[PDB]
Amino acid sequence: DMSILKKMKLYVEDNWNKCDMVAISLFVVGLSCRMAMSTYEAGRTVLALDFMVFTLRLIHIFAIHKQLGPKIIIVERMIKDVFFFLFFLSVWLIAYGVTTQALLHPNDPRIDWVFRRALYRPYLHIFGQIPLEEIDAAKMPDDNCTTDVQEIILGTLPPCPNIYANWLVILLLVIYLLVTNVLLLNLLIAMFSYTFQVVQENADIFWKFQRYNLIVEYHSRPALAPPFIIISHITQALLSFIKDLLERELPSGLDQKLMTWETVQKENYLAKLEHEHRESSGERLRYTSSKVQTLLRMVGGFKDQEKRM
Amino acid sequence: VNIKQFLTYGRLQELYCSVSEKNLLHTLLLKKNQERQAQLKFRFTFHEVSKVLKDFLDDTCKGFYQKLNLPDMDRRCEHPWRDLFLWAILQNRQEMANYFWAMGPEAVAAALVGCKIMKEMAHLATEAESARSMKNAKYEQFAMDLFSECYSNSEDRAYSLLVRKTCCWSKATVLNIATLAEAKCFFAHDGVQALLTKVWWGAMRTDTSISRLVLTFFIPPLVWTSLIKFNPESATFIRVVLRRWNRFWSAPVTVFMGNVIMYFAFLILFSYVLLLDFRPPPPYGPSAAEIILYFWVFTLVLEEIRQSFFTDEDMSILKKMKLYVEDNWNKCDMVAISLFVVGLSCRMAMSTYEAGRTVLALDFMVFTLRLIHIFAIHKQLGPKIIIVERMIKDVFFFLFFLSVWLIAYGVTTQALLHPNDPRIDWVFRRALYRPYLHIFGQIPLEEIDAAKMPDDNCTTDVQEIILGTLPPCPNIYANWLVILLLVIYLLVTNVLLLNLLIAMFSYTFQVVQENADIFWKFQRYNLIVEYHSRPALAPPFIIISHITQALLSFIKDLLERELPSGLDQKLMTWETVQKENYLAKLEHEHRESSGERLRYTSSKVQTLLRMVGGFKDQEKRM
Ligand SMILES: C[C@@H]1CC[C@@]2(OC1)O[C@H]1C[C@H]3[C@@H]4CC=C5C[C@@H](OCC[C@H](CO)CO[C@@H]6O[C@H](CO)[C@@H](O[C@H]7O[C@H](CO)[C@@H](O)[C@H](O)[C@H]7O)[C@H](O)[C@H]6O)CC[C@]5(C)[C@H]4CC[C@]3(C)[C@H]1[C@@H]2C
Ligand SMILES: C[C@@H]1CC[C@@]2(OC1)O[C@H]1C[C@H]3[C@@H]4CC=C5C[C@@H](OCC[C@H](CO)CO[C@@H]6O[C@H](CO)[C@@H](O[C@H]7O[C@H](CO)[C@@H](O)[C@H](O)[C@H]7O)[C@H](O)[C@H]6O)CC[C@]5(C)[C@H]4CC[C@]3(C)[C@H]1[C@@H]2C
């Protein structure tokens, strides 16, 4: 008993369910395009992407593992620092790449190659891919290059790089390499270290809380793994047409006994708290001070009476 | 003793003249007195204390004692507790200053003024003990605690208390005094941040999701729907829809995001002009998009100038220029505009066309860097900006170490490998450029290892080497030493220095993050204050708003508001009551402390011992 729309909303709420929906949609689209001949290659591409989606689903499958689940939670938390580093790197990379593309190839109309030399190459500079053959004049090859735009567009010859102020290009490359490959990367390492230290303890508790729900799900899951699971599904459907260790209901006597036992344990726990409060140092100090004040006034009266005699 | 009747102005000046002569206040008063005598009954006149207060605050203590120039010497002070607190504060007497603050009418402003004056005198302090006491004035702590009490009490009168114009401190807003004091911890308080968030979202509700706001921004008509909830409070209907439109588009957050979107449009247009639509000199004419870009930047500079200079009605032009050039990001802005002007000028010519293109290429980088300062206000990004700004120092330390090691290794290898290359450019190349690239996995062994050196056509003659006919042959006399030095350099640089820098960044992050958050909040206050007066139209449109403002000025605030006399007095009495409650709570917590109870018990036990001993002696006598 639950609303169908509410169930759909609850399902689509989870991100891993969104990944599952993406996977099944890609499978359907790829199969449909594969069935045709004019869209065969597109279907193959979509299925290739779907394999990646399923292999990623494998992580959510392993989420219940006792040693791996907290790591999944930790990575899910690290995503935020990843995004911060992405913002910084994106700003710096846009700047450096567009500036170098303007300084080096100011007469290349090809939009694809503009975007290439502006963003793809500076991005690969991070991972040790620094092709100086296109950036340093002393290292630029004596290849057959053209300056004419027409010939450049047709792709007859590669466009010659501009070497007007190449010292500026090399200086900018040096500064970009320093900033990106040192400051940003080591800053991200520090951010991950701090985030790990602050998050791990909460990640363990969250893993336990999620483990409860995963075990609850595994309770009703049929014992047969897919693709066999169809036998169990058919059996369940046939049984439903023809016709739990957790969340059990107990007899009245046992239920009342457990309720009284809970009440007794609660009384014991409250008595222990109160006793520990009475024996606390602060409470003892307060009691001693109050009783000393009372004793002072009373013994002062007694001493006055004694002096009267 | 009735302080109101006790403290006359003559008595106040008598107190000021009777300084200890061994503290900082006496030295400052002597300096002011000598300056006044050079510019030309009582050792010091109210002019000297007024000038000292002018040095310390420069805006608040105006007319405190100059208004009447001296007032009647027998006339009682209008604000006795304020003057007493100020007097006790100028001389580092903190216990007395505290007592006077506990009696003053406006306590938050007084505490902020006190902390400002203390941190101002901390620099001028001669003795180390006095400076240490001044740095621990904890007067900002008093303001934070009292405002926490006030915020817990009402949370609606607290905002009015923050934004009201105080009567004692020359119509100065409490937030204005906190800004003057640079009380960063005060701005970090949850109440001040909540008020700033309320200002940030304008008429909209602060809980509005960012995605809904962006979607409503991109599709304007959805403002009239119920997608975003608003805070409460033919001709009528038009007025209603216009009011809703204005209440949405006047919110500071919408103005900020519009500015960000149009700055992204600027970066896109600048890149397009620089990469695809950069035409020959004006003989063939700059592109129309280039003219649009020039107009764009003109509007941006107009907005910058207006924000920096025309926001303040009364302030020295030279002082405003100094304040503007003080900020580093303003220096970056000046560099950007100067580069734009130089690049445009060189582009207008034909003999300097390429130089102009190069300068504009650099300017694009400068503007894309300006984008970070634009995003500084973001709730999740700003602290990261602060953290990076702090990391710069460790970057410099690593740079020093790397520079020393790199100079050594590079010059040694250049001497060992190419001892007969006269070309200065290639000497500097092989000495510094190549060892620098060794850090990033660029190790060209083809020029360093003889077993890997190519059978290319090389010359040994210097003449031929200089002319560039053939590349100079590398020396292979002792190449085992070159390879050993390369190995040692690779080890040191790529392992020790890099992992040391990683450790330094880790430690710096851990130590800095908490202060960076508070500094972000303190800066966020000023950014929201700036967004208050910023016109709601993002550039290049902003020119319409500028023209409208100029026309309105020729023809003719939620923060820092002034309240009616009755409400002002009510809030002052409420502040006094909250201060009394806070002090009573502190005193009660002090009485119930374990140490105080132990002291009381010990003293009373001693008294009881002696008294009961006397009683026992009396009993034994019977
Ligand atoms: C510790 C810290 C590290 C980072 C840094 O600061 C210090 O290091 C600094 C070092 C510096 C660099 C030091 C040196 C230079 C060189 C200088 O050019 C000199 C001007 C001349 C005039 O155009 C250029 O020369 C000639 O160009 C020609 C290109 O047409 C070459 O023709 C080639 O044609 C064909 C190529 O296919 C082949 O026949 C041959 O290959 C060759 O014949 C010549 O061979 C070559 O002679 C430009 C500046 C630069 C790169 C410095 C930049 C800044 C640094 C990296 C510093 C860092 C901040
Ligand atoms: C764990 C730790 C790591 C770091 C380290 O310590 C341990 O490792 C050690 C290893 C060691 C190195 C071990 C070995 C050597 C070799 C030694 O040369 C032997 C002397 C002879 C005499 O000149 C040189 O040989 C010959 O040179 C000729 C150059 O004219 C080559 O001609 C080439 O000509 C043309 C090239 O275009 C082509 O025809 C062919 O390419 C080739 O014919 C010959 O082929 C080659 O036979 C020099 C020292 C060196 C590099 C050691 C240095 C120190 C280490 C890195 C240690 C670390 C601390």
Ligand SMILES: C[C@@H]1CC[C@@]2(OC1)O[C@H]1C[C@H]3[C@@H]4CC=C5C[C@@H](O)CC[C@]5(C)[C@H]4CC[C@]3(C)[C@H]1[C@@H]2C
């Ligand atoms: C991470 C972002 C995604 C979006 C984007 O920038 C990076 O991707 C880039 C890829 C570019 C493509 C790459 C190749 C070609 C082919 C060429 O004949 C015509 C131009 C066109 C379509 C380009 C148009 C602009 C595009 C989408 C860029 C776009 C801003």
Ligand SMILES: C[C@@H]1CC[C@@]2(OC1)O[C@H]1C[C@H]3[C@@H]4CC=C5C[C@@H](O)CC[C@]5(C)[C@H]4CC[C@]3(C)[C@H]1[C@@H]2C
């Ligand atoms: C980070 C520092 C900046 C300053 C500096 O060292 C690194 O830059 C280096 C670049 C060098 C240039 C590079 C190219 C040439 C061209 C050549 O035909 C004549 C010599 C000259 C001008 C060189 C002179 C010495 C220079 C400025 C070096 C200078 C100490």
Ligand SMILES: *[C@@H]1O[C@H](CO)[C@@H](O)[C@H](O)[C@H]1NC(C)=O
């Ligand atoms: C470049 O193209 C020209 C066309 O005539 C040809 O003569 C020359 O040999 C080519 N050079 C190279 C390096 O391919």
Ligand SMILES: *[C@@H]1O[C@H](CO)[C@@H](O)[C@H](O)[C@H]1NC(C)=O
């Ligand atoms: C080097 O130059 C000489 C000049 O005569 C030439 O004979 C020889 O073939 C050249 N070798 C190479 C590898 O270019």
